[PDB]
Amino acid sequence: MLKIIRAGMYTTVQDGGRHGFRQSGISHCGALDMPALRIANLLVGNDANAPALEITLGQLTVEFETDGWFALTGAGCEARLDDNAVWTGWRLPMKAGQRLTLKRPQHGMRSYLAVAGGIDVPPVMGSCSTDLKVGIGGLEGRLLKDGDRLPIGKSKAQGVKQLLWGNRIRALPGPEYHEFDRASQDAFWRSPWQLSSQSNRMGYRLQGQILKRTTDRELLSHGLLPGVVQVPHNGQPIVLMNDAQTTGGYPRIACIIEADMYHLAQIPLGQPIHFVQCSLEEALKARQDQQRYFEQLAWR
C-alpha cells in the first residue's frame, strides 16, 4: 500500500530494536535517532516502537495507495506533498494517489516517515529493524530501492514539539579512562572531534588528536553497547552505534549517555563533535527526562 519511486542512498525499515539477543551476537539495531521515530509513531497513533522508515539525507518519493494519516520527523528535508509544503512533527492527513517529495537537507542527516497502522512486514525475532550486515528484517534485509512497495497495517491533527540537536554530547569516563595520559584525557573533552567518511550505522570513526595510552596490556573480549567510545592502536576514537559488534577487545575511554545518543545521528559528515564530562546522577536524570518526555507526548 506504500509505493516507492526514488528510495535514496541509505533508506531502511527501522523499529524499537531486536532486543534479548545480545548474548548470541545479534545487534539490537533500530532507529539511530530513537526519539525521532517514537514521536512520528506517536503522532500517527501507533505504538512508539512501531516500524517506520529511516531515511539518510532525504531524496525520497513515496506514492500513497490507501487513505489514512502520516507524519515526518528527524532532519527537515522541505517535504512537498503534491502542491503544498508539509513540515516535520505533525499528524498530517493523506489521501490515495499523492506523492511526498523529500529533498537533500541543509541541516541534519537522518529523517523518519511513519504512517497510521505501521509498515506491515514480517517481524523477524520480535522486531522489524533491518540488519544490513546480517541480512534480516525490514524488506529482505537490504536498503530500499526504486519500484518497491511496503504494505501498511490496519490502524484501529495535533502538532508536537521536536527535540533540538547539537554538537555537544555528554559522555561518562572509563572503564579504561585511567590508562590514557593527562594530554589525552584533556584533549577528549577540550579538543573537537571531526566525523570521518567511514562512519556508518555500525560505528562512527572520529578524526582528531592522537590519544596516547600508557599501558600495552591485551584486553580480553568484553561485551559492548551503543555509545561506547573505543580507542584502537591508531589513537582515533570509534563511537559504537546500534548495528555495532556485541563483543570487542579495544580500550574504552568513554561512554555516551542514552539521552544524548540521538544527537550523533543528525551530525553531518564534515561537522565537529564536542564531548562534555558528565556524572551518573546527571546521566540518569537526563535518561528519565527523555523517558518522561514520551509520556507527555502520550497524553495527546
Binding site: 548470541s24 551476537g25 559492548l224 555509545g227 561506547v228
Partner: protein, 200 residues
C-alpha cells in the same frame, strides 16, 4: 580477584584477573542463566572471564549493581556435533596450515576433530562461537563463505555469515549455526560442547 565497574549508566561489568580459566567461565555461564530469568535484566552478555549485565531499571539498580553482582559472584552455583567437510573448496588453506604445523592434511584434521571444544561466549556476528583452547601444535599465522571453519593462531571457530575474514580456512559446514526462520534461531549457546565431525 573480581572488580565491578559501571559501563555507562545502564550496565555493570564484572571482570577477573588476566590469567583466564575454564572454572571461572563455568560460573559466568551459571550466572548468565540466573541473570536473564528475572524481569529487571534486559541482557546478560558473557565474554572472557567477564560478564556484562545490562539493566532495565538503572536509576534504582545502578549503585546496587556494584554491591549485588560482587555477592552473587562469591556464591557461584548440551553436546552438539557439527559436520565439517574438510579440504577441497571448503578448506583451501588446509594445505598451507598442514605445511606450517609440520603435519599432513589427515593429521591436521584428526587432532582438530579429536578435541571436544566448549563455547566460552558468542559475539562479533550472530551465533559465532569463541571456541577456547585449540591444540598448541595446530596454531599458525593468519568474502569468506557462510558456515566456513577456520583457524587464526590460538583461536578456532565457524563463520555463521558471509563477511571478510583473516582466518585460514580448513573446511566448510552445511549445518547453519544462525538461521533467522528455524524455531531456535541460534544453534550454539555459551557452555555447550562443540565437536567437529569429518566428511569427504
Amino acid at each position: 580477584r573480581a572488580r565491578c565497574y559501571l559501563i555507562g549508566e545502564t550496565a555493570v561489568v564484572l571482570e577477573l584477573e588476566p590469567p583466564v580459566t575454564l572454572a571461572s567461565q563455568k560460573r559466568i555461564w551459571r550466572l548468565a542463566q540466573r541473570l536473564v530469568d528475572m524481569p529487571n535484566v534486559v541482557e546478560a552478555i558473557p565474554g572472557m572471564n567477564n560478564i556484562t549485565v545490562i539493566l532495565r531499571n538503572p536509576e534504582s539498580l545502578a549503585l546496587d549493581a556494584i554491591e549485588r553482582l560482587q555477592r552473587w559472584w562469591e556464591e557461584s552455583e548440551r553436546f552438539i556435533e557439527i559436520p565439517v567437510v574438510y579440504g577441497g573448496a571448503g578448506g583451501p588453506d588446509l594445505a598451507v596450515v598442514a605445511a606450517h604445523c609440520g603435519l599432513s592434511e589427515k593429521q591436521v584434521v584428526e587432532l582438530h576433530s579429536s578435541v571436544e571444544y566448549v563455547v566460552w561466549f558468542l559475539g562479533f556476528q550472530p551465533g559465532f562461537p569463541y571456541l577456547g583452547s585449540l591444540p598448541e601444535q595446530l596454531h599458525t599465522p593468519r568474502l569468506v563463505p557462510a558456515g566456513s571453519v577456520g583457524i587464526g593462531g590460538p583461536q578456532t571457530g565457524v563463520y555463521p555469515l558471509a563477511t571478510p575474514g583473516g582466518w585460514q580456512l580448513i573446511g566448510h559446514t552445511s549445518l547453519s549455526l544462525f538461521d533467522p526462520a528455524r524455531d531456535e534461531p541460534i544453534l550454539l549457546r555459551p557452555g555447550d560442547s562443540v565437536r567437529f565431525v569429518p566428511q569427504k
